[PDB]
RNA sequence: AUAAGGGAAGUCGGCAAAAUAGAUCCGUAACUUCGGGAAAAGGAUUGGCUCUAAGGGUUGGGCACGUUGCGGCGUGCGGUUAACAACCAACUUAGAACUGGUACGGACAGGGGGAAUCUGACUGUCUAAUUAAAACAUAGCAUU
RNA sequence: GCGGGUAAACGGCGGGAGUAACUAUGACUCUCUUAAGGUAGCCAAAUGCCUCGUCAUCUAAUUAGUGACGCGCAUGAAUGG
RNA sequence: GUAUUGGCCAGCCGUGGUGACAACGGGUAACGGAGGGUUAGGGCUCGACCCCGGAGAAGGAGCCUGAGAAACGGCUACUACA
RNA sequence: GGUAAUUCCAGCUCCAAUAGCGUAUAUUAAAGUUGUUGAGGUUAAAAAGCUCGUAGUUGAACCUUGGGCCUAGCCCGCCGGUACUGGCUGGGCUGGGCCUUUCCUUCUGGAGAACCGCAUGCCGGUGUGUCGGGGAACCAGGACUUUUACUCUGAACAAAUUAGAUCGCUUAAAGAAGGCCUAUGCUUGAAUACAUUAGCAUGGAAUAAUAGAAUAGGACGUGUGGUUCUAUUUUGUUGGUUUCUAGGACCGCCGUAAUGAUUAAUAGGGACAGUCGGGGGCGUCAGUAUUCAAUUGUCAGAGGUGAAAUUCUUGGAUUUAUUGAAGACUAACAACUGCGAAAGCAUUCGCCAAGGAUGUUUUCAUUAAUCAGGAACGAAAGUUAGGGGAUCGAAGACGAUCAGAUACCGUCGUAGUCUUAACCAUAAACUAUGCCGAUUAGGGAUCGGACGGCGUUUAUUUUUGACCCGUUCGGCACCUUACGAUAAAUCAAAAUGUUUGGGCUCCUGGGGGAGUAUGGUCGCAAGGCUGAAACUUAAAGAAAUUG
RNA sequence: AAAGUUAUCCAAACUCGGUCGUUUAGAGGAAGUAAAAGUCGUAACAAGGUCUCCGUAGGUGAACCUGCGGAGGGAUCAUUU
């Protein structure tokens, strides 16, 4: 209650909606284009990078395990990120300087599960595909 | 200050009917109020009404007989075409069989059903069922 | 309620339904008009011209007896005041506050009242200009306002 | 007083010398006690000759009577020349053409500038004959 | 002589040991000690002996210059900061 | 002067024009439209791309012929490549 | 998931879609979590400290209604007859004509009807004819008509696309094709609606604005005078001149007429009368108390605490009576009471200007509501210069307590506490509840004004004042109830909201980072106003129930 | 009538200076978030053992303490001549 209701008050109603629309969080990040600027990916879906070293990451408080992440430097703009290697015993397939391909966890810029500070996962290594190697459908080229 | 005498009359009638009385008094009287009551009277929703004449504006005493659920007013008098008249009856009428939407046109104020017969349109001012 | 207040009083006067003089008046309309002009020349404003007639002898409503209002009657006889009386009294009160204010510099409450009174004068003067009672160039100058009252 | 090429490599130290300089028009930062800094920094023009335009002063104003050696006053009026005519007089400012061995504040006269530190607030004063300064004085503040 | 007041009066304003799941440091604690134990600030400064102190900047090369650090031989509040 | 109007340009003379009903300036991962996707109604979002209009031929300027070009599968000059 | 894993790695079995299924990013629905339709603001996120006011939005009622006849076009019911047809004094719907004081502008021309007679001819009607009294309607041309918004119907405007009609491409997404006996032939289709803002015409005349006669500068007349301009053809032709006549502009005299002004809002402003209040400013008067000082009498302790100590004392402390000075403050009366825009305001008297309510057969006539920017006031502490400095007491110094005590307790004590002239602009500035207007239920108390009444009291006494009973207008509040509202606590508003629209301004969108960084602006300073992002997280929070 | 030549106009390009925008190195200083067997106290929730909170000013290893003016979201809806 308290809106202008007259027949010639179309200017105030249109102006008010424009100003208060910024209080929304989903719309505010769309208008300013933060993804184009701050996100390591240039607003894209995938990216290619070079593996630097293998790192183990501890799980959060209730759990206890080693998550076995990896360090990657992006070819497109030279930034450095960390990515998670899914499935059981798959670090064995990746070596140093292996040209991996990455994607997201699907939480749209937030960490998934108990893994802290990790936002990406490895999809392909040496252009073969990680899951295909796991089921012994293909052999990794030398 | 008083900006819509029509709303005051319709609101006062609605309160008295909901509490079960039989008669109502309306302090200011105008042509639109009287022309509105006549449409309601011809459908049996009220009985006789009489307008006592003081020299300022006069008053009205209406006689109720039940049968009335609600009577409201739309404050911004929108402009409605003939083709879009079916949008409104879907909004503020309980059912298609009965109920009336009051319009004002160049041929006097009238309900939404005879206006279709005469093929006329205008402005919307209220409703009752 | 009130223009500048929070009160909501309803004190007023009730006009009788009848529009005809009482049978005991026995006074012609021409005599009343001549009676009005004599008092106006003595100095009375239209405000208390009516109350003298009502209280002292006879006429209760000048309009019913003669068909015209007091201010309309005076104008046709060349006796209308130069400025309307309602605006004249507002000017007179504003002058008296300024004279008192300069002697009592830090009376902060009376300073608040003066802003209200002057704000009421500007609103009322604008209405008179747009109807033609006052010339379009009329302005309320605080420096020379003291001459208008007296 | 002048010097090819280099331009402080000299020296405790740019000591001495050189460079800038008038007027008209553009442009001008940090900081600040909002007064300053400021001529900040940094650019353009300048002769001769033949022309054009602008900036002023003085005296004249139509009828109708009376005085007077073509006229000076007394007046009685009317009109505001859609501002005309004659004469007189110095300088200051702006613009155009042509011209030259591209020169012109042609001698004289005539500021080098910028980024920072230490120290006294400023103007002022003293060891005449080796020391002019951070020294003395000052307004302001406090005590007896 | 005995007893009070006064620092914009003259002037003054400290040492030794332990101690935090890698070293290091010491918020914390015991101890001697008197008129009080240098507070806010500031610094290799015209005030620092060791000293051409350590780090950065300026240069091909700087005992010089500037910005930081401070147990300061021997900075410091109208002897004014 | 131009195919013609026009402060389009040259002289002389006035002091104006836009703005809280948002001027001026900055952003656009901006060619505009017919239209695509998603739906109770009201809406939100996309449109380089077969149709219509505008602009460009590595970056800028200049010009010849001709009814029609400031053309680049036409010419001249500079800058960058070769 | 920590030794019998329905959740990992495997073997069986089963479920979902199926020539397809999974994953990442963008976008829509779900979202009434962006809310014009349609969203919260007492306590969960959120009403500016308060008032004035410009843009902007919004604004009370009133001017030709009704009635009486005729007639048409479309439906239904009924009757009867053969899907058809007629009728109902059929009842309805839409429309067109007349009289009621109203009806419908006007001139020229065109062609020509109806109603009329004229004579000529058939079985009381008719072509009669360049016959005339005569133009219903129609067409073309000229003049007059307050102006916008709104709606209805037309015109003009692109193909494709969307909706949609037709035809068995073997069905279908498509396509615009096809069909008939057999034909040296015939025949058809390639519709229609929508866009929608702006622009051009036509009918309607409710709703919402606007204009007109008040210093008459007003309307009308073949009434009657003037002075100015223009000049068609007629007197052969041209030029010059005049009269009459026709038109326009302007100004007099006379006549005609019902000669021209809507209410006075339980809207608003102003005036008047008797009052009321701890509202504001300046001056002045009074009260005890605390501290200090002087005089006076006596003699050993006084202070303070749960208990002690520091401190003061025969240089007479503490206590007792009289007198003096200084600064601050107004006890009891004092309350579910009063005034002010809020902050706030309490001893007496004098002066100065202001305000609410009530009363009224005064006056003006829409002058009004809320407000982006803008402006006035704004406790306490704090800041700049003077005056004052009794009491309390930030900082500071000591005594105890305690393992420690930079505190709570005790003795001292600086700025400050008060006032004049200028700054500052923030509070749990709270009713955590914005402003105007309407309606909705019972009750008893109370403050201010008016009106009515039976008595008591009382005075140089009546009328007035005090007390009692009842009605009414305006306030600060309270009790019961729930037809209502909410998650609940609870509420006469927090009600009249899924059956949702009386007007207007401001603010909020999960929790942190954060009222922080940076830029701007105001200030002497302390600081005020405006106000992000990176990053991080699955819960914070409100009301009530059992332990 | 070709080469050549005089004076305007349209003007690419380079040099120097000013100004605006984006990205990025830096001794040292001061914050935020998370993690972990850390050290020192016990400020808040009961009258949390000095009732809690708001504006302002000062002080202290740290939570915090004290002065002045407010609020009840309190531990009181209440005391008579």
Tab-separated table of C-alpha atoms in Angstrom, chain C residues 29-150:
chain	number	residue	atom	x	y	z
C	29	UNK	CA	-35.009	46.730	0.671
C	30	UNK	CA	-34.240	50.305	-0.402
C	31	UNK	CA	-34.020	51.493	3.212
C	32	UNK	CA	-31.544	48.724	4.051
C	33	UNK	CA	-29.167	49.654	1.222
C	34	UNK	CA	-29.053	53.307	2.307
C	35	UNK	CA	-28.482	52.138	5.888
C	36	UNK	CA	-25.504	50.005	4.835
C	37	UNK	CA	-23.691	52.813	3.011
C	38	UNK	CA	-23.858	55.157	6.011
C	39	UNK	CA	-21.966	52.708	8.233
C	40	UNK	CA	-19.386	51.918	5.540
C	41	UNK	CA	-18.497	55.603	5.186
C	42	UNK	CA	-17.933	55.747	8.954
C	43	UNK	CA	-15.165	53.158	8.611
C	44	UNK	CA	-16.647	49.729	9.297
C	45	UNK	CA	-15.481	46.768	7.226
C	46	UNK	CA	-18.044	44.372	5.659
C	47	UNK	CA	-17.262	41.926	8.461
C	48	UNK	CA	-18.857	43.903	11.299
C	49	UNK	CA	-21.314	45.787	9.096
C	50	UNK	CA	-23.487	42.673	9.184
C	51	UNK	CA	-23.198	42.098	12.929
C	52	UNK	CA	-24.309	45.656	13.748
C	53	UNK	CA	-27.501	45.221	11.713
C	54	UNK	CA	-28.221	41.795	13.211
C	55	UNK	CA	-27.552	42.553	16.872
C	56	UNK	CA	-28.921	46.079	17.186
C	57	UNK	CA	-32.125	46.190	15.126
C	58	UNK	CA	-33.868	43.852	12.735
C	59	UNK	CA	-32.153	42.370	9.712
C	60	UNK	CA	-30.744	38.884	10.234
C	61	UNK	CA	-29.741	38.164	6.622
C	62	UNK	CA	-29.056	41.067	4.281
C	63	UNK	CA	-29.216	38.742	1.264
C	64	UNK	CA	-32.801	37.600	1.834
C	65	UNK	CA	-34.083	41.159	2.308
C	66	UNK	CA	-32.379	42.746	-0.709
C	67	UNK	CA	-31.235	39.881	-2.944
C	68	UNK	CA	-27.565	40.920	-2.924
C	69	UNK	CA	-24.542	40.339	-0.715
C	70	UNK	CA	-22.978	43.124	1.337
C	71	UNK	CA	-19.685	43.228	-0.568
C	72	UNK	CA	-21.473	43.323	-3.923
C	73	UNK	CA	-23.655	46.211	-2.719
C	74	UNK	CA	-20.696	48.287	-1.528
C	75	UNK	CA	-18.797	47.895	-4.807
C	76	UNK	CA	-21.664	49.333	-6.865
C	77	UNK	CA	-21.703	52.432	-4.624
C	78	UNK	CA	-17.955	53.067	-4.930
C	79	UNK	CA	-17.060	52.061	-1.371
C	80	UNK	CA	-15.110	48.814	-1.833
C	81	UNK	CA	-11.762	48.715	0.008
C	82	UNK	CA	-8.599	48.839	-2.084
C	83	UNK	CA	-7.396	45.439	-0.837
C	84	UNK	CA	-9.562	42.538	0.397
C	85	UNK	CA	-10.169	42.568	4.134
C	86	UNK	CA	-9.031	38.976	4.714
C	87	UNK	CA	-5.644	39.739	3.153
C	88	UNK	CA	-5.477	43.079	4.987
C	89	UNK	CA	-5.707	41.467	8.428
C	90	UNK	CA	-2.997	38.910	7.633
C	91	UNK	CA	-0.609	41.730	6.694
C	92	UNK	CA	-1.402	43.617	9.903
C	93	UNK	CA	-0.536	40.642	12.119
C	94	UNK	CA	2.763	39.937	10.338
C	95	UNK	CA	3.968	43.515	10.877
C	96	UNK	CA	3.329	43.372	14.628
C	97	UNK	CA	5.391	40.188	15.023
C	98	UNK	CA	8.445	41.658	13.280
C	99	UNK	CA	8.359	44.761	15.485
C	100	UNK	CA	8.328	42.604	18.623
C	101	UNK	CA	10.897	40.161	17.232
C	102	UNK	CA	13.691	42.705	16.745
C	103	UNK	CA	13.513	43.696	20.428
C	104	UNK	CA	13.579	40.047	21.602
C	105	UNK	CA	16.229	38.555	19.339
C	106	UNK	CA	16.371	34.995	20.708
C	107	UNK	CA	12.650	34.284	21.140
C	108	UNK	CA	12.903	31.155	19.015
C	109	UNK	CA	9.209	30.262	19.280
C	110	UNK	CA	7.926	33.554	17.859
C	111	UNK	CA	10.334	33.089	14.950
C	112	UNK	CA	8.493	29.867	14.086
C	113	UNK	CA	5.127	31.653	14.085
C	114	UNK	CA	6.316	34.346	11.664
C	115	UNK	CA	7.249	31.737	9.048
C	116	UNK	CA	3.736	30.274	9.225
C	117	UNK	CA	1.961	33.635	8.895
C	118	UNK	CA	3.986	34.795	5.891
C	119	UNK	CA	3.566	31.410	4.207
C	120	UNK	CA	-0.201	31.881	4.528
C	121	UNK	CA	-0.028	35.324	2.899
C	122	UNK	CA	1.787	34.070	-0.203
C	123	UNK	CA	-0.787	31.327	-0.802
C	124	UNK	CA	-3.747	33.693	-0.436
C	125	UNK	CA	-2.210	36.435	-2.594
C	126	UNK	CA	-1.641	34.014	-5.482
C	127	UNK	CA	-5.349	33.163	-5.647
C	128	UNK	CA	-6.393	36.818	-5.829
C	129	UNK	CA	-3.946	37.534	-8.660
C	130	UNK	CA	-5.247	34.704	-10.860
C	131	UNK	CA	-8.863	35.889	-10.515
C	132	UNK	CA	-8.189	39.578	-11.274
C	133	UNK	CA	-8.663	41.251	-7.887
C	134	UNK	CA	-4.976	42.203	-7.648
C	135	UNK	CA	-2.635	43.440	-10.389
C	136	UNK	CA	-0.264	40.768	-11.724
C	137	UNK	CA	2.799	42.730	-10.540
C	138	UNK	CA	1.673	42.959	-6.898
C	139	UNK	CA	4.349	41.787	-4.464
C	140	UNK	CA	4.565	41.618	-0.670
C	141	UNK	CA	7.713	43.558	0.249
C	142	UNK	CA	8.541	43.276	3.948
C	143	UNK	CA	10.352	46.627	3.932
C	144	UNK	CA	7.443	48.789	2.747
C	145	UNK	CA	4.580	46.639	4.065
C	146	UNK	CA	4.167	48.859	7.140
C	147	UNK	CA	2.670	51.721	5.113
C	148	UNK	CA	-0.230	49.660	3.739
C	149	UNK	CA	-1.712	48.869	7.161
C	150	UNK	CA	-1.479	52.447	8.439
